[PDB]
Every structure is written in C-alpha cells, then in structure tokens.
Ligand binder design. Structure first.
Ligand code: NAG
Lengths: 49, 49
C-alpha cells in the first residue's frame, strides 16, 4: 500500500559470504542487485541488505 | 561442539528482541519510580514524596 521496496535479512550469516551464497550468477537480475550496494549492515541477527 | 552438530542439520536459534541491557534499563526505571514516587507513578504522573 505504501511502496514496492524491500530489505532482505540473511539470518545468522556474515556478509563476506552473501554474493556467493545468493545464486548471483545463476538467478533473475532483480535478485542480483539484492546482494550489493553501499547499504550493507551487519547486525547480530544476520546481515541486512 | 554441542551446538555445531545441531547447526549443521537445520536447527538454528534466533536472538531476542530486547537485549539484556535493555531489560536492565527497564527494571532500573521501576526501581527509581518506587523510591522517589511511591505508588503514584503506576496510576498517572509521578508525584514525589
Ligand atoms: C565476519 O568476517 C569478519 C572478517 O574478518 C570477521 O572480523 C568477523 O569476526 C566475522 N564474523 C563472524 C565469523 O561471525
């Protein structure tokens, strides 16, 4: 109702692993850009992109 | 490890929302209201005595 943007949390995982974790070279291009950016924040719950 | 055999098989553990020093901030705001206000802070605004 408000927007179409999303954030994605990868639970209990260090984000020095995410772009090879997500199937980046073998997926849709819209799952591709939800692996990169300057918006990468490492929490205790996981990594928030 | 004890936890690594569980973690390798699909069994994860999620963290609590309030950290252990947020819960300790809550109980010190309940100590400080009882000592300085009596019982009045649980029924409205805190009145000192
Ligand atoms: C994630 O990787 C960084 C890179 O050195 C490391 O400092 C950090 O401790 C790691 N976190 C883990 C393994 O939970």
């Amino acid at each position: 109702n408000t927007s179409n943007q999303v954030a994605v949390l990868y639970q209990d995982v260090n984000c020095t692993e995410v772009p090879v974790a997500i199937h980046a070279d073998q997926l849709t291009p819209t799952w591709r850009v939800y692996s990169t950016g300057s918006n990468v924040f490492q929490t205790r719950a996981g990594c928030l992109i | 490890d004890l936890i690594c055999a569980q973690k390798f098989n699909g069994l994860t553990v999620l963290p609590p929302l309030l950290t252990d020093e947020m819960i300790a901030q809550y109980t010190s705001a309940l100590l400080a209201g009882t000592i300085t206000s009596g019982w009045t802070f649980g029924a409205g605004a805190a009145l000192q005595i």
